[PDB]
Amino acid sequence: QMYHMKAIVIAGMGFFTDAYDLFCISTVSKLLGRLYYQPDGSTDSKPGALSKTANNMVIGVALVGTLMGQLVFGYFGDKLGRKRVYGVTLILMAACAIGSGLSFGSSRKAVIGTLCFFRFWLGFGIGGDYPLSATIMSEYSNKKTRGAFIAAVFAMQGVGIIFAGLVSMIVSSIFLTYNKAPSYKGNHDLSRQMPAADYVWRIVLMIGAFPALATFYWRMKMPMEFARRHGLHLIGTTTTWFLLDIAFYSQNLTQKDIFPAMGLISGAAEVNALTEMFQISKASFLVALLGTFPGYWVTVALIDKMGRYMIQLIGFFMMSMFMLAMGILYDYLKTHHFLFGLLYALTFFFANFGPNSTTFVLPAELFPTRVRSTCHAISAAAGKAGAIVAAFGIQKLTYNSQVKSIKKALIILSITNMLGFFFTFLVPET
Template sequence: MVNKFLLRGLGFFNDAYDLSVINIINVILQDQYTKGVYTAQMKSNVSSAALIGAVLGQLTFGFLGDMYGRKSCMVATCVILIVGGILCAAAYGGSAVNTLWFLFVARGILGFGIGGEYPLAAASSSEDATSTADRNRRVALTFSLQGVGFIFAGLMGLLMVSVLDETKTQLEIMWRVLFGVGVLPALFLVYFRITAEEPEAYKTMLTEEVHLRTVRWTFILKHYGRSLVGTAGTWFLFDIVFYAQNLFTASILSVVGAKSTLRTIALQNVLISLVALPGYYVAVFFINRMGRKNIMLMGLTLMTIIFLVLGIGWHSISGNATVFIILFGLTLFFSNFGPNMSTFVMPTEMYPTAIKSTCHGFSAAMGKAGASVGSYGFALWVDNPSFGYIGTWYTFAGISLLALIVTWFCMFDHNGESSELDNEFKALLAQEDMETRKSFSHDTYAIEATPHVQRV
């Protein structure tokens, strides 16, 4: 039997691989089809398709996860990952342009499954915890497999470009194999998810008949609106930066330093991922020691500073690949030891069990909406002579600063037990029901007490 950590974490590894493998595939497709066919616009379309699908998946499965349970929904997302991955690997449209549009649709389907994993993995990981500290550590460890997925995607890209030549036929083999590999973890997981059980906290909630069927969005916004501004707003802003970086690292490296081969770009891409990866595990170590909000504030502050350095010194930094790899890698390190980890963990502690999946899914969806903005816009921004990379780095610095401000005013650590939030939620819901019944009774009495006027 696969343990609970791998049951959720391996799915997240799968998601990260599927999202980030487009990084090196973008360069491969551009070499195969040339910039005349794989234009900046088409690159933005293909890169952002999975993110747009993820927004829909997060909203849909966040809601369904609270309505129908974590288990059945995680089986469904696993199946969608398999179907979407197969469609990506088999993409064909009769011509280069049609094949790319087929890939756009297939990536959207894949993204729908990827998106569903976010709220379900987060909610179920937190609900199996034995204590507050264990809850944060479990969720953080599950999320840390995103970094492993990024590394694996980079290594697979490096392997493909090392064993195959850069002919059109072999370039096509490269990207199809890279997409196909992403199907394997989901194929492995689907049986174990079918035989898994619901988390205890969710089962307890069902026995008390307190779940999303009894809650209106007006209630959620009234009592948890500020928290939603914090979790959704920071995730939206941060992911504009984070996914623009991660999905286009290989494209950025192609313009840094001397003219590089595909193999050199793939190697440098792996090196950046290696610099970034420890950030996840430093965050896991400090998740309870520093607190999630402090980690987020620290990471955003350092990201803002490094982006300003990149913007100010771009003319000299762009000619030195080593300096760029260190600075760019550090922005990703402090993303992971910072807002990337905190935006995922904090919704699991800021919302009660009955609406946790829904609110986490909504927040994650706003994150992927931001990622779509970054993914779609990045290729267009850097190709604009009046904006370019310098304008992009300054924009990233400004967005990071804005996310820091929202974090300061709208985010909080909850160091108590989840049951405290659940009890508070039930009390608020009972109070709301009582007020509704009183209002209804008063209206009914007023109608009955109104004298009937006989029409003459």
């Protein structure tokens, strides 16, 4: 029946909101670069985009905020109350989501500064939310089985990822009907669509306030020696979270750069300002629907039949092998745009089928109650550090650059995945 579905959605609303808020920023970055950096006339190259520093800062402010918000709310926030922290975080995220669409001026520096300032505290709220709070897993999930509880609630991160692309596509298509302009190869100034394109990204960013209020409503009506013996378990958990997050965020954020270099989306200086965003949204929507979404539904039915160890092991192995194959066959995959789609999508599939639905129960069924919270917080902090490295690291190689740099970045991604496969051996299952 649908009562189980209602319970699953009520539990996973937090993950859905977090995923939407964190992954709605990839689609609108190109529009911001095209609007606030392209000058009138003086054309010598592709349409202006964000500088490396500005692009990296815009992408990573939210994640740095998540780190410094989670640390504070965890260490110095346990003496205030669950309902109180829920309310504060869920109102802060909504307020910052609404404020991200409003600017303090007209200059590009003022707009960028306001956007970064509001994204910082949006990420602060997201990190301090601690979306699922360990309680429901310390419930039925920790005791009897972890079969269709964790892997079912986490199926909403995929839903949020799809919905981000869906709303971007809907808004861009609606604004595209009444806004027709020649491509950048034609009239250079008119391709900006400045009077109209200045509102679409604001609308996309401020749509995210609705999920925060929805989860507010839906959740405010619901009432050293031990470490020495454990030893390598701590480093195992931290590494298995770090080397997963560094790949997941890298492959979700670098979507806007790999596709223009590999078929699919056409050349940058051949498309209008809005329809390019629409094409990127459609590509992301298709990849997240056919690739990412089936991963959770494959995972849910195999938690008990296969286990938790071998599934993660094979997931990491396929991650590494597919990444290495894509890196090696770059030149061949340039011409053939057909199988590149599936080579890119099965990476997401094996990520979802792999340790993506596995690294949170890893602290569970282990780490006895004496120091469980400290180890869980340490593992989460390691994951957030991996996310920050993904936003501020490999992005420096993938963004703009040339053919050699993206091949290199794929090489380090494959190496890191193989290292994670090596490191996930010192964690058995009982």
